[PDB]
Write a protein that binds this ligand. Structure first.
Ligand code: NAG
Ligand code: NAG
Ligand code: CA
Ligand code: CA
Ligand code: CA
Ligand code: CA
Ligand code: CA
Ligand code: CA
Lengths: 149, 116, 33, 58
């Protein structure tokens, strides 16, 4: 004479998440090398972005990390970013400067050509300070993810 | 999925076996560890469908982190091969932003309310 | 003797939106000189 | 057409009778949707769920 509660049944599954949404690799291998006080026009290189499982849309924020250090060396400096990875859709996404260093861009289904990567080259416009000489000065850009879906 | 991604996934199936002089079973299905899974997900939904009859496919219940419990009915039409029920699980989810983890279990519980 | 609630029926669909309304491309290749 | 459902009035009651039961064994009902999406919202893999409940049979 045993009374049973009739609730001894179970089933189990698992889940995990062990990687960040994006990976970023840099290929900026050109040097802005004008004369002192000259006004110029130069291109720099391109940057690769890699997107991972179940990712479709990424929201990004790009800023100039060392704008304060570059102020005494330049009257003005502007960076132009364009998306090109789709051979049919070329688009300029943001313009950065020493006065407004930050911008927010959107990457969507059209940008993700080859289904796995984004290619973005950098375009620079500049004017150097009068009579200033220097060498080995780095320019740094930073990326931060705000939302992914 | 990746951290913060929105996805779409299937899990597997569960077998139920019915014994002598049993014709209709009333069941209650709940998420046992919903409280543990809350900090890891914005939302998570489970869809249960009866398929064991090749002619009659039916979705019976939808479970979520806000309403973890449901009551379903299995009848003469479901009991194909006269001895077993097959139910697969369908999952919809969105992961929390910037959260990384591994080896996290998901548990389901069954309780019998009435049999005839 | 089982009493049923008679509400165990469902149907499911899906929807999505994964692109912006417009795309813009530039061809300004002349100089004011 | 038997019912129209919306986000403000999600529920409706319909009647099926001798005329509807063609082939004497089944009912066929297609779904028609009208919509307007929110401005600037992007998403994917979003389900839409409908539920049925029997009130009376004869
Ligand atoms: C990256 O995003 C694209 C475009 O939305 C998508 O087709 C692709 O599956 C994503 N990559 C991975 C590895 O999920
Ligand atoms: C299980 O239920 C089915 C359907 O009602 C019935 O035909 C079958 O005999 C039951 N199984 C046993 C072992 O009694
Ligand atoms: Ca990584
Ligand atoms: Ca000058
Ligand atoms: Ca010049
Ligand atoms: Ca676009
Ligand atoms: Ca998200
Ligand atoms: Ca997704």
């Amino acid at each position: 004479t045993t009374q049973s509660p009739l609730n001894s049944f179970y089933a189990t599954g698992t889940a995990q998440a062990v990687q960040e949404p994006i990976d970023v690799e840099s290929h900026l291998d050109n040097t802005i090398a004008p004369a002192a006080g000259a006004q110029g026009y130069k291109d720099m290189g391109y940057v690769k972005i890699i997107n991972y499982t179940d990712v479709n849309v990424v929201k990004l924020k790009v800023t100039l990390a060392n704008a304060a250090q570059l102020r005494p060396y330049f009257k003005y400096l502007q960076l132009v970013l364009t998306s090109n990875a789709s051979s049919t859709v070329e688009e300029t996404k943001a313009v950065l400067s020493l006065k407004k260093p930050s911008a927010v861009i959107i990457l969507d289904n059209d940008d993700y050509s080859s289904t796995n990567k984004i290619q973005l080259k950098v375009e620079a416009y500049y004017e150097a300070k009068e009579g200033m000489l220097f060498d080995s000065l780095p320019v740094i850009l930073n990326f931060q993810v705000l939302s992914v879906s």
